[PDB]
Design a protein around this ligand. Structure first.
Ligand code: CYC
Ligand code: CYC
Ligand code: CYC
Ligand code: CYC
Ligand code: CYC
Ligand code: CYC
Ligand code: CYC
Ligand code: CYC
Ligand code: 45D
Lengths: 5, 160, 67, 161, 148, 90, 161, 161, 160, 160, 160, 161
């Protein structure tokens, strides 16, 4: 779970 | 229907259908069995397809259901599930018709204006239909996977 | 293609045209659905009175297959 | 306009549901009939000028309708009648291929009856010409495809009546 | 720009001609139908870029070259979003078309005085026969002041 | 449980105006640390700052009177203005 | 179209007499109301989209019309309804600025009732949508300008009746 | 449009037969009338505007039609009346020169009544103006040509009625 | 009115009124008081204005009142004075409106054809309007005369 | 080419190929082997095909070579045969390309002008093309017969 | 600018500027001292006005900055602040010019295309500009607050 | 314009001959390309907005090109650049699915350099935009399909420069 900054 | 599309083209040209249109309709009528198989599979596995795709979309874009978002609240996430159901059924209609006319006519024309009015992230909806594409491809056969993927690609591009 | 037929009376408010003008002052045409809104906006802005309009071609509320 | 497939899709979308077994069998029936429909359309396109020619020759030529005072007299209105018959044939082929009369009622009967009434066109003579067209088409294509073509052309006749 | 005898297998506009002769559509509707035709896109839309398509369309329908870069931008947006049919419909249902040709006059070549350069642009458009060259008479208007 | 939200809605339903107002006040107190954080921008507050400024200008006694009238659904212009708004506005 | 001033001028000119005391009083009334009308127009131009969205949500969303088989169903019909309500808002604001309903009569009401009759669009539903727009605009502008804005919207609904 | 010559030719052509003694009689009668027809047409062309001048002066001027509240009020409506009377005079001259009142049907009366009803033009006042034009033209061009023009003017007024 | 002009312009652009336009309507409604005062002055002194302008025009153009002229005869002169009153009323309407649209709509469209039909020298009519213009300017304050001069000479130029 | 045909049709709407167009391109690219095979099967019998077709047409409509006729002379008989050969090359082009575009662009557009200028009967030339199609169907395989007869049928109907 | 807008309208009607347009330009040029002062005030409060404007925007809709939002990291939030400074500069331009044409020319044409290609929530952009306007009005004189609020409001309406 | 298939067809036709062996092998090569081209076109139609989005984000985005002075400033010019990229991508897909650059150099290179010079467009920045388009398309279509797409885009760049 993450979103590429 | 591709038959209706070919008829529209022929009547626009004021001529009878050409060999290309005849071969197209012949191939469609011969492949109608596989098309109906794909439609039946999608209808049977609709709820699991939509739920898995919606959860993958949630993981991709958690902010969609985060507080202050359009999908926030169980009501506003069930409405996403309903919209995904609508678009999956529209894809089934397009698969069974062979052309994108019903999709463009029921879910593509005016969709951007509707989602502007409702505040929805159409890019997020495009990601959701993408995820539905992978889920349906997994649940579905490989040979028909390309055929269904073509219509998913069309919808993703148009609603993108 | 779900066309519209309209009867509209468009008067002349700026110029006194000396040649025959019923053919464009009181006319009944067949308008496509896509262009109906634009045509009606143009007619109203030109000041004509839309006496009548009716969906001559097509079926009301067709959820699919309207072309 | 809508073919049989699009008509079924519209009927399903009216209740906003996936296609059930009834729609499944309807689509199967249309897909089965499409093999015949394609061949009938091909032969009709092959003889498109033909069927019109023999139908007019056997139905209206050398008659009072063509004689002076007849409502086909003079070359201009004769060509108008021929163009109308060609219209009817092409739209009948369109309706046959689509499997539905939606295109026909959308395009051929849009004010055609009132137009013919105002012009004084002989409705009975028009019906006879369409019947000759139907007979020639049935002879060319066969009993079955001829039957579908005839039911469509009879729809044109009913609209014109 | 020509009589359509050597460019058609048979006249596909027979239905439009019949409707016009029955008076159920006006000459403006006939013009719109001619514009939204496979032959028109074959002749002036298929073999030219969108800028040249805009030039040819405005010359054929409005009777004059593009008004300005604003008109060019609007028509390019129309062509990019809805293709050629929407372009023809917009150019034919605009208020300029009705104020000039009305609902009964076939469009004709115009000799406008304004705005600037419109007269020379229309002159260059109309003084050359069909398919004389592929260059663009008015590709765009170089703005005097550049924003940003 | 699937029916947690409708059950809680019914439970809030039988409570009276005082119970509802106290519960919402304590919910705001627990907000952020215990309950869901607030992101008011998603709602069209532009059609609500008028009533907000009006209530701010109102005196404390009339402020509480209007608040209780809203809580018990009294027939007041402010009550009708609140009611006509969408639920996110509310 | 017309405004308050042009309406008064025409009312005097029809009997061909100069602007008397009553005409001057009406002109003074409109001139006084001008500042309020301009402020309300500024507010509505501020919140054009939001007013329509709130009105439709509180009036039509999650109701029978938006469901499959409803007039507002499908993206195309949703967009059409949104556009119609947006034009209604804009033209009601126009009428509020002008002080007269002539703009609505000759730009929003001729060719619209029978257009909805042809399309099957729900007049009883669009009436309530306009009423929701009226409520939203009243809440934004305030009671003073809101009363006249609602007057114009009620005029629109009555004409649509 | 058809003149006496075209009417005779159509009467022959509907039977599809060459011209006979009756056709020659009709043609020579029209040829005899042609001298008077051409002279009356030339004089009316020479002084057409004047004729409209006296007709409007003796039919509508200094009346409620021209006064405020009447449909001849305002310069735009006055010029519209002048142009309409020019239309009627020109087309009456056309019909007189042709010998048949079909140009009036297919070029004047075609939608004129409905247009007048939609725009509010007073049919009775228009008929009175037509009668005034007929009287002036008769007094200006004599007895036989006067009656010839008057029959077509009465045709136009009856069609208006 | 400027209100109607701005509304029509905004509608043609398919938008709402811009801030500058709304400021312009604000200025117009502010100046409405002076407009009404000018209109009241013209209405009060209309008969004197009409009489003086008619006398001045008759002296300047005796042919129109001469035998064989259009205005020859007491009834013709009275009708011409009625026309003068009509144009003064139109000028008052234009003054109150702040634009020339009412004047143009009521008595400036087709005026040339109208007076050609009536056999009235349009240059003489324009001269009469001019005479009414100077009479009103004398009878009215400097600023108000300047305001009414725009409508007066607009009518004069259009009819000339 | 059906490729360029669908390309132009899509560019008319300024969009990529639809699922129907891409599917038909799939079918055409797959069946190009059989298409080229029918290409050789018709390009190998050109002399016999035209000879038999023209010979049959000569007694079908003897007026073509009758005295005072269109092709009464030996030279005009040979010229009619050469037109038969041109049209057969055009149909071969169309069958290989999968679209009637080569037919239209080479030997159909303005052909009515051609044959009214030269006085030749369009119905007779259509009957000649029908004879060509009949002989080709006789001398080629069954499925190839239908495939080539589609384009023979198109040219026959369009020209006739 | 207001002068540019008046010139454009006069050119469109093919005429000289009306007395109303001239007096409006005169009033604008006379009162320009206040407009320049307010532009100076907003320029000075630029840094803070952006600071608390962005803070209030993020608090009102953290989803744009939360995971999944357009500006999730500090880097993209810095870009969002950069855009907010763009729009502040545009509103300053509008205040100095007196008319919204610079705003439309620079940052409102194709803005929907820009913020649909970037995936930015245009509603979020509208809310950010609205908070900008609220804080500017708070730190600005009330009447001058309305003077700047006209342009802020126009930008808000165009964004929405 | 033309593709490989129409190129072989008209190359044969200009000499007026049937399909020789060279044409047969050319057609076989194009058919072998075939499904690869159709798959690349389908994936491009899938992610149509994607390739342009990340191509801008790679090359043009966050630079003096999109800064003041650079041609990308203002939302209008930004959206114009996006529209140009969409034109270029659709023409690239068309040229890929066809097999020839005739569509491009008839719909792209005609006057494009001069129009961009008239608008003062940065040819280098445009070329970089098409480059980023090329890599983003390659990363989604594969190796050989991406290579041929890049070849077509490079022809576009050469024509632009
Ligand atoms: C006097 C110096 C000038 C002059 C005037 C004149 N007018 C008439 C007759 C008419 N004038 C009008 C004009 C109008 N009616 C309207 O409603 C309006 C628009 C609001 C206008 C401008 C009309 C209609 C008439 C006809 C009578 C009627 O009441 O309808 C005359 C008499 C002409 C005659 O032959 O009767 C005269 C003398 N004529 C000049 O030469 C001077 C320049
Ligand atoms: C005058 C004595 C009466 C009268 C007339 C009047 N007519 C109009 C407007 C129009 N009149 C026509 C009629 C025709 N146009 C034609 O071309 C022909 C046939 C060749 C006819 C009979 C039309 C079409 C119009 C409207 C369009 C136009 O004018 O070009 C008006 C003006 C109405 C208005 O305000 O729009 C008037 C006043 N009115 C009377 O009161 C007299 C009895
Ligand atoms: C022929 C079987 C009969 C006949 C025909 C006839 N028709 C007309 C005139 C018209 N026919 C139509 C119909 C259509 N036009 C279209 O475009 C289509 C839709 C594709 C249709 C169905 C129309 C509109 C007209 C009038 C305009 C025109 O010329 O097309 C005529 C001539 C009438 C006249 O007086 O000009 C004739 C003779 N007549 C017979 O006797 C047959 C029974
Ligand atoms: C979910 C992942 C995304 C999302 C969706 C969402 N949609 C709504 C509300 C509606 N959705 C529709 C859509 C359609 N109606 C149709 O007829 C068709 C085709 C058949 C479609 C696609 C409609 C009309 C509504 C309005 C409600 C109603 O139908 O009655 C919501 C609710 C929004 C709200 O707050 O009210 C949501 C959340 N939103 C996201 O953010 C996701 C990207
Ligand atoms: C929304 C509140 C309701 C609704 C909307 C709806 N409208 C249409 C179609 C049209 N609406 C118009 C409207 C106008 N034309 C004008 O000139 C004016 C003045 C501003 C108006 C308001 C027109 C012309 C059309 C037809 C062309 C077009 O569709 O754009 C539809 C589509 C109907 C159909 O496709 O069959 C819809 C859905 N529907 C509701 O249920 C609401 C009550
Ligand atoms: C034979 C089936 C029918 C027939 C043929 C016929 N044609 C001509 C003469 C010409 N035919 C053409 C046509 C073409 N030439 C081309 O290159 C192509 C394009 C691919 C076509 C369609 C031309 C151009 C000519 C004249 C010049 C030339 O031959 O190149 C004739 C003789 C005409 C003459 O008077 O010399 C004939 C007889 N005639 C029939 O009756 C058959 C039905
Ligand atoms: C902040 C309030 C919202 C937001 C902003 C946001 N913007 C970008 C990136 C860009 N924004 C622009 C816009 C403009 N440049 C101009 O010159 C003009 C007019 C002067 C405008 C409107 C541009 C060009 C970019 C691209 C980068 C650049 O400027 O070089 C981002 C980041 C996008 C990315 O992928 O990097 C963000 C986050 N996002 C929100 O959610 C807020 C509502
Ligand atoms: C963006 C990718 C790069 C860029 C370019 C840029 N283009 C414009 C404006 C136009 N571009 C075109 C080009 C075409 N139109 C077509 O139809 C075709 C083929 C399909 C092409 C190649 C046109 C015609 C215009 C003007 C009309 C319009 O707006 O559509 C601009 C704006 C110029 C201006 O003066 O406003 C720009 C900036 N600039 C870059 O930095 C990118 C590398
Ligand atoms: C006087 C008096 C009393 C006192 C009575 C009084 C004064 C009572 C006071 C009652 C009040 C004012 C209670 C406030 C409740 C507010 C809540 C729960 C906030 C909800 C907002 C949320 C969840 C935000 C949601 C949001 C999110 C995240 C979105 O996603 C969308 C946006 C949105 C912002 C909507 C007593 C009753 C005690 C009796 C004795 C006595 O003397």
């Amino acid at each position: 779970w993450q979103n590429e900054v | 229907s591709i038959v209706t599309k070919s008829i529209v083209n022929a009547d626009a040209e004021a001529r009878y259908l050409s060999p290309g249109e005849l071969d197209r309709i012949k191939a469609f009528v011969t492949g109608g069995a596989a098309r109906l198989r794909i439609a039946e599979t999608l209808t049977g596995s609709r709820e699991t397809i939509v739920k898995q795709a919606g959860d993958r979309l949630f993981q991709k874009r958690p902010d969609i259901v985060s507080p202050g978002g359009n999908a926030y609240g169980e009501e506003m996430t069930a409405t996403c599930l309903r919209d995904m159901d609508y678009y999956l059924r529209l894809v089934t209609y397009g698969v069974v018709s062979g052309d994108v006319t019903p999709i463009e006519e029921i879910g593509l024309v005016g969709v951007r204006e509707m989602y502007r009015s409702l505040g929805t992230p159409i890019e997020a909806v495009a990601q959701s239909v993408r995820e539905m594409k992978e889920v349906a491809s997994g649940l579905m056969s490989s040979d028909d996977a390309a055929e269904a993927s073509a219509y998913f690609d069309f919808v993703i591009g148009k609603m993108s | 293609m779900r066309m519209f037929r309209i009867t509209a009376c468009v008067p002349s408010q700026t110029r006194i045209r000396t040649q025959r003008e019923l053919q464009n002052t009181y006319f009944t045409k067949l308008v496509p659905y896509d262009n109906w809104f634009r045509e009606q906006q143009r007619i109203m802005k030109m000041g004509g009175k839309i006496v009548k309009v009716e969906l001559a071609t097509g079926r009301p509320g067709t959820n699919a297959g309207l072309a | 306009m809508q073919d049989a497939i699009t008509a079924v899709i519209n009927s399903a979308d009216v209740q906003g549901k996936y296609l059930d077994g009834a729609a499944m069998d309807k689509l199967k029936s249309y897909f089965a009939s499409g093999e015949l429909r394609v061949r009938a359309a091909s032969v009709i396109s092959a003889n498109a000028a033909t069927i019109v020619k023999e139908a007019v020759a056997k139905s209206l030529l050398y008659s009072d309708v063509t004689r002076p005072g007849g409502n086909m007299y003079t070359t201009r209105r004769y060509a108008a009648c021929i163009r109308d018959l060609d219209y009817y044939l092409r739209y009948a082929t369109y309706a046959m291929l689509a499997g539905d009369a939606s295109i026909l009622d959308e395009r051929v009967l849009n004010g055609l009856k009132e137009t013919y009434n105002s012009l004084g066109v002989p409705i009975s003579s028009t019906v006879q010409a369409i019947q000759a067209i139907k007979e020639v088409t049935a002879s060319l294509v066969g009993a079955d495809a001829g039957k579908e073509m005839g039911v469509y052309l009879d729809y044109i006749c009913s609209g014109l009546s | 720009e020509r009589d359509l005898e050597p460019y058609i297998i048979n006249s596909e506009f027979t239905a439009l001609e019949s409707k016009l002769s029955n008076n159920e559509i006006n000459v403006k509707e006939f013009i719109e139908g001619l514009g939204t035709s496979e032959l028109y896109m074959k002749e002036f839309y298929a073999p030219y870029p969108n800028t040249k398509v805009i030039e040819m369309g405005t010359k054929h329908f409005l009777g004059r070259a593009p008004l300005n870069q604003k008109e060019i931008q609007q028509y390019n947006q129309i062509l990019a979003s809805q293709g050629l049919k929407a372009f023809i419909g917009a150019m034919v249902n605009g208020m300029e078309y009705l104020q000039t040709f009305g609902e009964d006059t076939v469009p004709y070549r115009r000799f406008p005085t304004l705005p600037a350069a419109n007269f020379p642009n229309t002159e260059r458009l109309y003084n050359k026969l069909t398919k004389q060259d592929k260059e663009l008479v008015v590709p765009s208007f170089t703005p005097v002041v550049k924003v940003g | 449980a699937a029916d947690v939200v409708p059950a809680t809605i019914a439970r809030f339903s039988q409570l009276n105006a005082e119970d509802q107002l106290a519960l919402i006040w304590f919910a705001y107190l627990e907000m952020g640390k215990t309950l869901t954080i607030a992101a008011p921008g998603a709602a069209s507050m532009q059609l609500a700052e008028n009533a907000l400024k009006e209530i701010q200008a109102m005196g404390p006694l009339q402020q509480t009177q209007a608040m209780c009238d809203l809580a018990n659904r009294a027939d007041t212009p402010l009550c009708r203005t609140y009611a006509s708004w969408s639920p996110n506005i509310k």
